[PDB]
Amino acid sequence: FFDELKIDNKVDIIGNNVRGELPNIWLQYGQFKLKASGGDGTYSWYSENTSIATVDASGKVTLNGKGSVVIKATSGDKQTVSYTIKAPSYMIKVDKQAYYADAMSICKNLLPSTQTVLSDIYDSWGAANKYSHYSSMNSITAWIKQTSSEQRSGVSSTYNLITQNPLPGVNVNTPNVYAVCVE
Amino acid sequence: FFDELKIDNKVDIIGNNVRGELPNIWLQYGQFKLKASGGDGTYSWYSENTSIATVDASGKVTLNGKGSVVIKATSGDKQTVSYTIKAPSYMIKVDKQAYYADAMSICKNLLPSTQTVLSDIYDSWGAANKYSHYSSMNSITAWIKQTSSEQRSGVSSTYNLITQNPLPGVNVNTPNVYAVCVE
Amino acid sequence: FFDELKIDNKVDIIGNNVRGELPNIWLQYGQFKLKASGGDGTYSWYSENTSIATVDASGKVTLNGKGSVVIKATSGDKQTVSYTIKAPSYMIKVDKQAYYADAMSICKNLLPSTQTVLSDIYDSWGAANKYSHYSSMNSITAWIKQTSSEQRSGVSSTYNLITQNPLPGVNVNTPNVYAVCVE
Amino acid sequence: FFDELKIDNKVDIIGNNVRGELPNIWLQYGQFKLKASGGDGTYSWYSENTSIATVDASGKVTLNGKGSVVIKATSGDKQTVSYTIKAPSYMIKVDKQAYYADAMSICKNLLPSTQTVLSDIYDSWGAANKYSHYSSMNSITAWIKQTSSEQRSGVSSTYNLITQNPLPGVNVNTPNVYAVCVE
Amino acid sequence: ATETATRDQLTKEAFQNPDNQKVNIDELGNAIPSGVLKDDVVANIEEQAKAAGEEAKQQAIEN
Amino acid sequence: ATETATRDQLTKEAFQNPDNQKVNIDELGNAIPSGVLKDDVVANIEEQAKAAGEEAKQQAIEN
Amino acid sequence: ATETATRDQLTKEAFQNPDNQKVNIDELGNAIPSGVLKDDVVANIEEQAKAAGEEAKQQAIEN
Amino acid sequence: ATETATRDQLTKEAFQNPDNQKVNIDELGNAIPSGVLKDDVVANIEEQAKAAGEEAKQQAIEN
């Protein structure tokens, strides 16, 4: 007497209890939980491609790479469907902390092009420490590719993913600054 | 066919979804919500003394002064009971922002005696901006009565209620610092 | 069988073997020798006024003051005549050595008005040390009333009677400088 | 009826009316006058060697070089004799004025070895300007080979032949200083 | 020279205004006194003392 | 005097180490370069230059 | 200030030219280094350092 | 450095005492202010400022 199965479109955003659909931009290892309904009562989730993504027995998802992928939800009464996770423009990835000089190096020339970037990730996914991969962290301050202007003063600005906190004119050689890349 | 009435002991802490009993220490204008049960189905709350406290049609409480007081919950079927709010050791109150010199003045010699104070308020009630009176605020940094040591360097340390963020050695003349008193 | 007596007009200048007549200007204690002729063979000299002048048994004269005076030459055969020494414009007198400040004081405002003064005394009488009162001296450097010009630089110039040697711009406080007055 | 001829031993010292015998040390171009007596009445002087010396029709002698030489005095009645001028230890010669550096050079390492030298020349012959070759000069200041001591301070002392005037510690590069050699 | 000091006084006069100081970050994304001047401000200062030197020289030469 | 400069060099040598600088707070509880030295450090520096002055004097007096 | 040194360098730059030094006299009418500058030259120098001070101030004030 | 000035003050403090100044001679064998210090005195001074520099450094290093 079971019902059609189906993975709810809107997704749950672990990072900020804000229900909606997957964002165009991604915070690597970000996390959203999927919802199933009808058929059996149990539900089993699995992901087409593991690199790009993953999910635990509950729907909590962790994006671990850039690209597209599909999640298969199978109900205990052999009823299975897929939810497609389509690639983003860019997906922020956090490498090791280091002076802007090498930040720009680490992240092979790919550093956030402007503050108007990470801000979005935050506005969207929220505080990085909300997610599993982070959480055990209270600080993440990012490099933002210095503009010739602030280039001359030998500095650049930052953004703290876990806290926003924009800081202008920073020593392009201060310790405690993560080298966030942009894929 | 109604049931005995009764205001649930444990209280809800607006500021951090942590359910428990009222804290020994208070953040003025802090907020906890009371729970009623049995009798009629409606519930009407009121507070013995308005100065010391207040509550809206829902149980959300706002402490507005130091002392003890009682909350009366009356069910639509004329069934009424009281919940006692007993005075705290001290209750942090936020006056206007100003140099430590006058901070200690504003707060008539009563400034937090040590960091080990506001920390508790936070640990307990949480981020000040969670509450109505605040919220529209992203920063509250407090004075902490300089120790002779840091007295000599003409400075003192701070705590940001809305964010913790302990800062040592601060210009005892920096703007943007609230003068938190202690009753 | 003796001859008319008579004191030769021209006078001998102890200070520079230059024979001529007494100079209009005088170097106090300067010395000129008078010549007698005819009558007896011996000769006795004497001076009307001792202050203003003096002379030893030989004709050597020493002027010791300002004014006019007469020298009486008497021959051993009671034949006596007079030679008149008439006052000069001014007669240089050497007081004690001291800073220009007091030089001008010592010499009650009367210091040489210009280099064009002592130079004459020299040109005329010669090296001060030639005379008895001096001789045992190798140096005499004089003050010359500073011109407003060199007044500003706090200095003045000098002349060394015993040696000429003009020195411009001198410390109006150098030791070893005599305060020559001008009567 | 003429008398034996003969050149008086003692010599006249042009430079200081001091009669005595030729000095062991010489001031080049110094001048002494010889005295003849007896025979005829006229007298003719001549010098064996012209370089080393010379003499005018009067006996005035000018030494112009180092060595020994003889002066022949011939009376108008063909009576002739010689006066021997024997070489000195050293004979001071005045080269051109220049910095000690080159003074010591000009005078091929031969500069007065000490003040105790020129002093003698003076004490003996007197003021250099007394003699023909000089006279038209009021100043002659000499180099004295700096002692290691005053070598370190980069200086040396001097003596003014025409005036004595010893000056200690002099700029080994001051202009107006003659390079007196010593043969 | 003279510039030596014109250096040390402007370098210090600079640490009076924060906007000349570079900023450094601590354990928790907090800003704190780096202890350095922005390359361009120091740049200018150096550029000044030199000139001020070519002052008390191009002028110390009053004979 | 000489102290004049010993002042300006240590005052600047001080803004090399943050722990000498006072701290100021911005709009959002963030720490930032105040632009001042802790009273005691400046205190010491002043206390030094004076002494250094009583050096090139109690010594400049080599005759 | 800054003037402090502008003082000491011109005061020394002055003892390079004799005609600024006062003269003193020894035992025998001989001229010798007094060890002082003519009131007016020192006067000017002082008058300068002050001005040079009202320079790296009326200018050190570049914000 | 700091030595820069320790230089200029002792160089000037030196022209206070004649016996440090070299002497020059004029037209008539007269002594006059040369305008220079005896190599050894200047020598020492230079030798001092350096040391005084290795002072406010070997000491400016109080953290």
Swiss-Prot record, chains A, B, C, D:
This is Intimin. The lineage of its organism: Bacteria, Pseudomonadati, Pseudomonadota, Gammaproteobacteria, Enterobacterales. Has a signal sequence, a periplasmic Lys M domain, an inverse autotransporter domain (residues 210-411) predicted to form an outer membrane-embedded 12-stranded beta-barrel, followed by a linker domain (residues 412-449) also embedded in the outer membrane, and an extracellular passenger domain (residues 450-934) with a tightly-folded proteinase K (PK)-resistant, non-Big domain (residues 450-550), 3 Big domains and a C-type lectin domain. It is found in: Cell outer membrane. Homodimer. Interacts with Tir. Belongs to the intimin/invasin family. Disulfide bonds join 107-181. It comes from the Bacteria. 'Inverse' autotransporters have an N-terminal translocation domain followed by the passenger domain, as opposed to 'classical' autotransporters which have N-terminal passenger and C-terminal translocation domains. It comes from Escherichia coli O157:H7. Residues 1-183 are annotated as: Intimin receptor Tir-binding. Residues 36-82 form the BIG2 domain. An inverse autotransporter. Adhesin, which mediates attachment to the human intestine epithelial cells. Necessary for the production of attaching and effacing lesions on infected human tissue culture cells. Anchored to the outer membrane by binding to peptidoglycan (PGN) via its periplasmic domain, thus helping in receptor interactions during host invasion. PGN-binding may also aid in resisting mechanical and chemical stress during transit of the bacterium through the gastrointestinal tract of the host. The record marks 140, 143, 147, 155, 157-158, 164, 176, 178, 182 as: Implicated in intimin receptor Tir-binding.
Swiss-Prot record, chains E, F, G, H:
Phosphorylated by host kinases. Disulfide bonds: none annotated. Disruption phenotype: Mutants show reduced bacterial adherence to host cells, and a loss of actin condensation beneath bacteria. It comes from the Bacteria. It is found in: Secreted; Host cell membrane. Coiled coil: none annotated. Multifunctional protein that is required for efficient pedestal formation in host epithelial cells during infection. The extracellular region acts as a receptor for bacterial intimin, allowing the bacterium to attach tightly to the host-cell surface. Simultaneously, the intracellular region initiates a signaling cascade in the host cell, which leads to actin polymerization and formation of actin pedestals at the sites of bacterial adhesion. In strain EDL933, acts via the effector protein EspF(U), in a phosphotyrosine- and NCK-independent manner. Interacts with intimin. Interacts with host BAIAP2 and BAIAP2L1. The intracellular N-terminal region contributes to the initiation of actin assembly and influences pedestal length. The central extracellular region is involved in bacterial intimin binding. The intracellular C-terminal region is required for initiation of actin pedestal formation. Belongs to the Tir receptor family. This is Translocated intimin receptor Tir. The gene is tir. The chain holds residues 274 to 336 of 558 of the full protein.
